[PDB]
Design a protein around this ligand. Structure first.
Ligand SMILES: CCC/C=C\C=C\CCCCCCCCCO
Ligand SMILES: [Mg+2]
Length: 141
């Protein structure tokens, strides 16, 4: 659900700043990872794709070929409250996007294209949070 995705996003986003330099991702492109979900944030920059690799690697969410590791992704998602309701759908949805971009061999570019597809399909399927839901989780600390 969108509520569960808010919790996943809020945690996943904590590795933005440590990944910023190696990805070449300007603050001007993305200042806080929660804005990934803004209606009018365009998910396009190769640097954001590099950042997403870097952030995923932190939680072993990538397989040897820089695609989603399905098992580790499922385990990550179920580590959040009610995570089991989202885990099957989210893997299926991401993997479907990956197949559409399998002919992009540049890893950063492939991953940003996959991220954009995942955002769009997440809205269609009802698992996209609003920024305010993401902020509400972050704000409990
Ligand atoms: C991914 C869990 C954190 C929540 C939102 C972040 C979304 C951006 C990226 C979606 C996953 C992309 C990994 C697939 C790479 C295929 O080569
Ligand atoms: Mg490769």
């Amino acid at each position: 659900t969108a509520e569960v995705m808010s919790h996943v996003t809020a945690h996943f986003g904590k590795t933005l700043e440590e990944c910023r330099e190696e990805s070449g991702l300007s603050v001007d492109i993305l200042d806080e990872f929660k804005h990934f979900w803004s209606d009018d944030f365009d998910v396009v920059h190769r640097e954001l794709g590099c950042a997403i690799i870097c952030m995923s690697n932190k939680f072993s969410l990538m397989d040897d070929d820089v695609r989603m590791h399905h098992v580790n992704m499922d385990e990550y998602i179920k580590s959040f409250p009610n995570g089991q309701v989202l885990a099957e759908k989210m893997v299926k949805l991401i993997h479907n996007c990956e197949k559409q971009f399998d002919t992009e061999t540049d890893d950063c570019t492939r991953v940003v294209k996959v991220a954009a597809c995942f955002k769009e399909d997440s809205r269609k399927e009802g698992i996209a949070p609003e920024v305010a839901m993401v902020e509400a989780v972050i704000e409990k600390y």
